[PDB]
């Protein structure tokens, strides 16, 4: 007895969930966009020792065709959380238990062939009594794909079972740019491989190396031109760190204009440059004059100043006489949001970005594994657009425990435990490959970056307010945002149908 059903991308499938009602999926997407779905499996009676899973090509009218090479398959790995993330307010974690999060790849990206010799293998796999298994399916729509309807199949098979489900995909007559409109800064502290950067870029996230040795500080950004071409890299940091942080309220004099210009000229031209100058120093009012000194030198070199602090009117003028702010990219937590200050800085030409960590308030989306999966998607797209925010930052992606496939309690502090804090990718060793593999949460971030793009496209077409009415219906602010994946899917489809229509006049 083999029970099969589908689930949407941001639907969590628990090991003990009952079987759903459909084993088909219907999706909609633009050229250059991903859409994903899950195939959940249960053996209500007995066991299946040897379960396999394949997909077809997707075929449309006439010669229209999307190769199965555009589909990426993974088996979900469940991790056991024994200590809850903090429980406060109305946005709560779901409790100790098994959570699907790491993704076991069918294919090693290095070879384009199945891994061999891993401790954990995607297929074949055993389906044991009552504990569900789940396949994650990514579909990347080719940049050139013909608009219209496509269909294909997935096949689950075992020694006593074979079940075939339909994949239905509608390709809309628009494209998402290779270069994401949303800018980002996601920090890598430990895994210095080019495959680590590439895994993040494939998910539309821009990264910077952090905690670099004095020796490797200032190495030349050798690969950046390649990554612009291949992955649409949309910004880069110069790496002048002041060392000022929450614990260190002191700033030295800035690097000279000449030094900043030399750093800038190592990067490709026609690339937005910023400098992450200081972190969470909003309490230290002594630092305002030093921040303006840094700003003036960066501005003379055509470089943007990025600080994780909230807009303060004392820093709306860098002291140069131009009227430009001392901070060009203000990066804030949900809890720091102040509508009036944000309106002031957007009006004068600055950017505001969001960042997240820990569990610091009662109401905002929280980035831990034991929270609703929607919280990783809703922040970069709908809420950011509702509030006029134009980027996202995250402090670390590789904060692994010593047993990273089995222990995801990555931070313990002040009597609190955090599940997945600073960890969005998993090491490949456990699945027999050299490079990192993605999490389910990284897939949600990617999707939210695509949601942002839908809204940006409508803004660019002259339909900003129309798009914000929709955005504000599901994610107006940090307090009031939907917990229901169906409503976000509904909102996205309204946006996508409209763009389709406007491009087919
Ligand atoms: Mg505890």
Tab-separated table of N, CA and C in Angstrom, residues 271-378:
chain	number	residue	atom	x	y	z
A	271	UNK	N	28.962	47.941	-11.487
A	271	UNK	CA	28.526	47.127	-10.352
A	271	UNK	C	28.362	48.033	-9.134
A	272	UNK	N	27.166	47.988	-8.542
A	272	UNK	CA	26.884	48.733	-7.329
A	272	UNK	C	27.788	48.299	-6.176
A	273	UNK	N	28.530	49.273	-5.607
A	273	UNK	CA	29.460	49.024	-4.517
A	273	UNK	C	29.008	49.681	-3.224
A	274	UNK	N	29.194	48.923	-2.134
A	274	UNK	CA	28.867	49.414	-0.811
A	274	UNK	C	30.006	49.012	0.104
A	275	UNK	N	29.953	49.510	1.355
A	275	UNK	CA	30.862	49.120	2.416
A	275	UNK	C	30.063	48.935	3.692
A	276	UNK	N	30.131	47.714	4.252
A	276	UNK	CA	29.543	47.353	5.535
A	276	UNK	C	30.484	47.853	6.633
A	277	UNK	N	30.192	49.049	7.147
A	277	UNK	CA	31.168	49.808	7.933
A	277	UNK	C	31.168	49.470	9.428
A	278	UNK	N	29.985	49.195	10.006
A	278	UNK	CA	29.815	48.976	11.429
A	278	UNK	C	28.481	48.257	11.656
A	279	UNK	N	28.312	47.602	12.827
A	279	UNK	CA	27.198	46.683	13.132
A	279	UNK	C	26.559	47.004	14.487
A	280	UNK	N	25.260	47.329	14.495
A	280	UNK	CA	24.442	47.408	15.698
A	280	UNK	C	25.064	48.348	16.732
A	281	UNK	N	25.419	49.552	16.278
A	281	UNK	CA	26.061	50.562	17.098
A	281	UNK	C	25.097	51.712	17.386
A	282	UNK	N	23.775	51.476	17.263
A	282	UNK	CA	22.782	52.547	17.392
A	282	UNK	C	22.738	53.235	18.772
A	283	UNK	N	23.206	52.555	19.836
A	283	UNK	CA	23.237	53.101	21.196
A	283	UNK	C	24.364	54.129	21.394
A	284	UNK	N	25.417	54.081	20.569
A	284	UNK	CA	26.609	54.894	20.787
A	284	UNK	C	26.509	56.200	19.999
A	285	UNK	N	25.885	57.221	20.591
A	285	UNK	CA	25.755	58.523	19.946
A	285	UNK	C	27.114	59.221	19.697
A	286	UNK	N	28.184	58.880	20.443
A	286	UNK	CA	29.546	59.398	20.205
A	286	UNK	C	30.100	59.142	18.794
A	287	UNK	N	29.550	58.140	18.118
A	287	UNK	CA	30.101	57.687	16.859
A	287	UNK	C	29.552	58.472	15.664
A	288	UNK	N	28.616	59.409	15.877
A	288	UNK	CA	27.993	60.099	14.751
A	288	UNK	C	29.040	60.837	13.904
A	289	UNK	N	29.942	61.616	14.530
A	289	UNK	CA	30.944	62.347	13.771
A	289	UNK	C	31.864	61.414	12.971
A	290	UNK	N	32.434	60.341	13.570
A	290	UNK	CA	33.184	59.325	12.820
A	290	UNK	C	32.443	58.669	11.648
A	291	UNK	N	31.166	58.338	11.839
A	291	UNK	CA	30.361	57.811	10.742
A	291	UNK	C	30.316	58.816	9.589
A	292	UNK	N	30.105	60.122	9.857
A	292	UNK	CA	30.096	61.119	8.794
A	292	UNK	C	31.437	61.231	8.080
A	293	UNK	N	32.555	61.069	8.818
A	293	UNK	CA	33.894	61.074	8.228
A	293	UNK	C	34.079	59.891	7.266
A	294	UNK	N	33.680	58.676	7.700
A	294	UNK	CA	33.633	57.517	6.812
A	294	UNK	C	32.769	57.776	5.582
A	295	UNK	N	31.550	58.320	5.786
A	295	UNK	CA	30.628	58.586	4.696
A	295	UNK	C	31.275	59.499	3.654
A	296	UNK	N	31.906	60.580	4.117
A	296	UNK	CA	32.440	61.558	3.176
A	296	UNK	C	33.481	60.904	2.258
A	297	UNK	N	34.380	60.078	2.828
A	297	UNK	CA	35.433	59.407	2.069
A	297	UNK	C	34.847	58.359	1.121
A	298	UNK	N	33.865	57.579	1.600
A	298	UNK	CA	33.210	56.610	0.717
A	298	UNK	C	32.540	57.336	-0.452
A	299	UNK	N	31.812	58.441	-0.193
A	299	UNK	CA	31.015	59.159	-1.181
A	299	UNK	C	31.923	59.754	-2.258
A	300	UNK	N	33.113	60.215	-1.863
A	300	UNK	CA	34.076	60.783	-2.805
A	300	UNK	C	34.555	59.694	-3.753
A	301	UNK	N	34.479	58.440	-3.299
A	301	UNK	CA	34.883	57.306	-4.113
A	301	UNK	C	33.689	56.646	-4.826
A	302	UNK	N	32.484	57.199	-4.685
A	302	UNK	CA	31.294	56.672	-5.344
A	302	UNK	C	30.779	55.369	-4.720
A	303	UNK	N	31.032	55.185	-3.422
A	303	UNK	CA	30.673	53.957	-2.700
A	303	UNK	C	29.621	54.235	-1.624
A	304	UNK	N	28.633	53.328	-1.492
A	304	UNK	CA	27.557	53.491	-0.521
A	304	UNK	C	27.970	52.997	0.862
A	305	UNK	N	27.571	53.726	1.913
A	305	UNK	CA	27.803	53.359	3.307
A	305	UNK	C	26.633	52.516	3.838
A	306	UNK	N	26.910	51.271	4.283
A	306	UNK	CA	25.921	50.351	4.882
A	306	UNK	C	26.211	50.109	6.352
A	307	UNK	N	25.229	50.416	7.202
A	307	UNK	CA	25.292	50.146	8.625
A	307	UNK	C	23.976	49.517	9.083
A	308	UNK	N	24.068	48.578	10.028
A	308	UNK	CA	22.938	47.976	10.720
A	308	UNK	C	22.587	48.901	11.884
A	309	UNK	N	21.882	49.964	11.515
A	309	UNK	CA	21.300	50.890	12.474
A	309	UNK	C	20.049	51.522	11.860
A	310	UNK	N	19.156	51.978	12.736
A	310	UNK	CA	17.940	52.662	12.306
A	310	UNK	C	18.207	54.125	11.933
A	311	UNK	N	17.482	54.660	10.939
A	311	UNK	CA	17.574	56.071	10.558
A	311	UNK	C	17.456	57.013	11.757
A	312	UNK	N	18.420	57.933	11.848
A	312	UNK	CA	18.429	58.968	12.878
A	312	UNK	C	18.760	60.292	12.205
A	313	UNK	N	17.987	61.378	12.465
A	313	UNK	CA	18.119	62.603	11.677
A	313	UNK	C	19.471	63.289	11.842
A	314	UNK	N	20.179	62.989	12.925
A	314	UNK	CA	21.547	63.464	13.123
A	314	UNK	C	22.492	62.955	12.030
A	315	UNK	N	22.124	61.874	11.309
A	315	UNK	CA	22.971	61.293	10.264
A	315	UNK	C	22.318	61.409	8.880
A	316	UNK	N	21.348	62.332	8.733
A	316	UNK	CA	20.787	62.619	7.421
A	316	UNK	C	21.646	63.570	6.579
A	317	UNK	N	22.754	64.086	7.125
A	317	UNK	CA	23.641	64.990	6.394
A	317	UNK	C	25.101	64.624	6.723
A	318	UNK	N	25.870	64.191	5.713
A	318	UNK	CA	27.228	63.692	5.893
A	318	UNK	C	28.228	64.822	6.121
A	319	UNK	N	27.763	66.076	6.162
A	319	UNK	CA	28.655	67.186	6.490
A	319	UNK	C	29.483	67.690	5.302
A	320	UNK	N	29.290	67.120	4.111
A	320	UNK	CA	30.028	67.499	2.920
A	320	UNK	C	29.419	68.729	2.254
A	321	UNK	N	28.144	69.034	2.517
A	321	UNK	CA	27.444	70.095	1.803
A	321	UNK	C	26.517	69.599	0.694
A	322	UNK	N	26.612	68.316	0.305
A	322	UNK	CA	25.772	67.738	-0.735
A	322	UNK	C	24.342	67.511	-0.250
A	323	UNK	N	24.160	67.311	1.056
A	323	UNK	CA	22.883	66.908	1.632
A	323	UNK	C	22.704	65.388	1.684
A	324	UNK	N	23.681	64.630	1.173
A	324	UNK	CA	23.558	63.169	1.163
A	324	UNK	C	23.645	62.630	2.583
A	325	UNK	N	22.911	61.534	2.868
A	325	UNK	CA	22.916	60.970	4.202
A	325	UNK	C	24.320	60.413	4.478
A	326	UNK	N	24.663	60.256	5.753
A	326	UNK	CA	25.885	59.600	6.170
A	326	UNK	C	25.752	58.074	6.050
A	327	UNK	N	24.517	57.550	6.068
A	327	UNK	CA	24.269	56.119	5.856
A	327	UNK	C	23.348	56.022	4.637
A	328	UNK	N	23.801	55.288	3.603
A	328	UNK	CA	23.052	55.150	2.360
A	328	UNK	C	22.114	53.938	2.389
A	329	UNK	N	22.544	52.901	3.096
A	329	UNK	CA	21.766	51.680	3.236
A	329	UNK	C	21.619	51.425	4.722
A	330	UNK	N	20.429	51.756	5.245
A	330	UNK	CA	20.091	51.548	6.626
A	330	UNK	C	19.494	50.144	6.761
A	331	UNK	N	20.071	49.314	7.599
A	331	UNK	CA	19.621	47.919	7.703
A	331	UNK	C	19.033	47.698	9.079
A	332	UNK	N	17.731	47.326	9.143
A	332	UNK	CA	16.997	47.284	10.410
A	332	UNK	C	16.294	45.948	10.650
A	333	UNK	N	16.143	45.626	11.943
A	333	UNK	CA	15.271	44.564	12.389
A	333	UNK	C	13.829	44.990	12.236
A	334	UNK	N	12.904	44.013	12.098
A	334	UNK	CA	11.478	44.361	12.172
A	334	UNK	C	11.099	45.266	13.360
A	335	UNK	N	11.651	44.957	14.531
A	335	UNK	CA	11.244	45.654	15.730
A	335	UNK	C	11.721	47.098	15.721
A	336	UNK	N	12.666	47.449	14.856
A	336	UNK	CA	13.201	48.806	14.824
A	336	UNK	C	12.446	49.719	13.858
A	337	UNK	N	11.476	49.168	13.124
A	337	UNK	CA	10.770	49.896	12.089
A	337	UNK	C	10.009	51.094	12.666
A	338	UNK	N	10.260	52.268	12.085
A	338	UNK	CA	9.621	53.514	12.486
A	338	UNK	C	9.161	54.192	11.204
A	339	UNK	N	7.851	54.162	10.928
A	339	UNK	CA	7.331	54.559	9.627
A	339	UNK	C	7.788	55.958	9.261
A	340	UNK	N	7.722	56.890	10.216
A	340	UNK	CA	8.000	58.275	9.875
A	340	UNK	C	9.467	58.470	9.463
A	341	UNK	N	10.416	57.884	10.226
A	341	UNK	CA	11.838	58.007	9.884
A	341	UNK	C	12.136	57.337	8.533
A	342	UNK	N	11.530	56.162	8.306
A	342	UNK	CA	11.737	55.447	7.057
A	342	UNK	C	11.214	56.288	5.893
A	343	UNK	N	10.075	56.953	6.040
A	343	UNK	CA	9.551	57.779	4.970
A	343	UNK	C	10.546	58.907	4.670
A	344	UNK	N	11.178	59.482	5.709
A	344	UNK	CA	12.088	60.604	5.510
A	344	UNK	C	13.302	60.213	4.656
A	345	UNK	N	13.882	59.036	4.973
A	345	UNK	CA	15.090	58.623	4.292
A	345	UNK	C	14.773	58.080	2.893
A	346	UNK	N	13.638	57.403	2.673
A	346	UNK	CA	13.283	57.012	1.325
A	346	UNK	C	13.037	58.256	0.458
A	347	UNK	N	12.446	59.305	1.048
A	347	UNK	CA	12.130	60.513	0.300
A	347	UNK	C	13.398	61.184	-0.208
A	348	UNK	N	14.506	61.082	0.547
A	348	UNK	CA	15.715	61.803	0.174
A	348	UNK	C	16.690	60.920	-0.616
A	349	UNK	N	16.337	59.655	-0.850
A	349	UNK	CA	17.058	58.840	-1.810
A	349	UNK	C	17.854	57.695	-1.194
A	350	UNK	N	17.662	57.407	0.093
A	350	UNK	CA	18.405	56.321	0.729
A	350	UNK	C	17.668	54.994	0.508
A	351	UNK	N	18.353	53.900	0.859
A	351	UNK	CA	17.721	52.581	0.877
A	351	UNK	C	17.536	52.139	2.313
A	352	UNK	N	16.485	51.341	2.547
A	352	UNK	CA	16.345	50.639	3.797
A	352	UNK	C	16.216	49.146	3.491
A	353	UNK	N	16.969	48.334	4.242
A	353	UNK	CA	16.900	46.883	4.116
A	353	UNK	C	16.468	46.251	5.431
A	354	UNK	N	15.965	45.008	5.363
A	354	UNK	CA	15.613	44.320	6.586
A	354	UNK	C	16.668	43.246	6.857
A	355	UNK	N	16.819	42.912	8.143
A	355	UNK	CA	17.571	41.745	8.540
A	355	UNK	C	16.805	41.107	9.690
A	356	UNK	N	17.176	39.864	9.989
A	356	UNK	CA	16.491	39.095	11.004
A	356	UNK	C	17.521	38.264	11.779
A	357	UNK	N	17.200	37.932	13.025
A	357	UNK	CA	17.927	36.946	13.801
A	357	UNK	C	17.259	36.773	15.164
A	358	UNK	N	17.497	35.601	15.726
A	358	UNK	CA	17.024	35.255	17.050
A	358	UNK	C	15.490	35.339	17.124
A	359	UNK	N	14.943	35.680	18.310
A	359	UNK	CA	13.494	35.758	18.539
A	359	UNK	C	13.224	36.951	19.462
A	360	UNK	N	13.161	38.140	18.882
A	360	UNK	CA	13.389	39.359	19.654
A	360	UNK	C	12.110	40.147	19.942
A	361	UNK	N	10.956	39.649	19.481
A	361	UNK	CA	9.696	40.369	19.620
A	361	UNK	C	8.557	39.355	19.531
A	362	UNK	N	7.336	39.817	19.769
A	362	UNK	CA	6.189	38.938	19.835
A	362	UNK	C	5.534	38.666	18.474
A	363	UNK	N	5.841	39.425	17.404
A	363	UNK	CA	4.919	39.530	16.257
A	363	UNK	C	5.559	39.306	14.887
A	364	UNK	N	6.870	39.565	14.748
A	364	UNK	CA	7.528	39.587	13.436
A	364	UNK	C	7.770	38.167	12.935
A	365	UNK	N	7.966	37.939	11.623
A	365	UNK	CA	8.469	36.646	11.139
A	365	UNK	C	9.801	36.327	11.794
A	366	UNK	N	9.969	35.055	12.177
A	366	UNK	CA	11.175	34.585	12.840
A	366	UNK	C	11.852	33.526	11.977
A	367	UNK	N	13.176	33.653	11.899
A	367	UNK	CA	14.015	32.768	11.100
A	367	UNK	C	14.682	31.669	11.964
A	368	UNK	N	13.872	30.691	12.364
A	368	UNK	CA	14.368	29.416	12.882
A	368	UNK	C	13.593	28.273	12.241
A	369	UNK	N	14.181	27.072	12.299
A	369	UNK	CA	13.563	25.930	11.645
A	369	UNK	C	12.175	25.613	12.221
A	370	UNK	N	11.995	25.779	13.534
A	370	UNK	CA	10.744	25.375	14.173
A	370	UNK	C	9.593	26.390	14.023
A	371	UNK	N	9.820	27.474	13.258
A	371	UNK	CA	8.726	28.371	12.931
A	371	UNK	C	8.077	27.964	11.608
A	372	UNK	N	6.879	28.513	11.361
A	372	UNK	CA	6.168	28.292	10.107
A	372	UNK	C	7.098	28.574	8.924
A	373	UNK	N	7.259	27.676	7.905
A	373	UNK	CA	8.174	27.961	6.792
A	373	UNK	C	7.932	29.251	6.000
A	374	UNK	N	6.679	29.732	5.999
A	374	UNK	CA	6.331	30.956	5.297
A	374	UNK	C	7.194	32.142	5.751
A	375	UNK	N	7.712	32.128	6.974
A	375	UNK	CA	8.404	33.312	7.518
A	375	UNK	C	9.697	33.657	6.787
A	376	UNK	N	10.340	32.671	6.147
A	376	UNK	CA	11.522	32.935	5.335
A	376	UNK	C	11.167	33.557	3.974
A	377	UNK	N	9.968	33.290	3.441
A	377	UNK	CA	9.544	33.781	2.141
A	377	UNK	C	8.953	35.184	2.290
A	378	UNK	N	8.151	35.398	3.361
A	378	UNK	CA	7.287	36.593	3.385
A	378	UNK	C	8.074	37.878	3.619
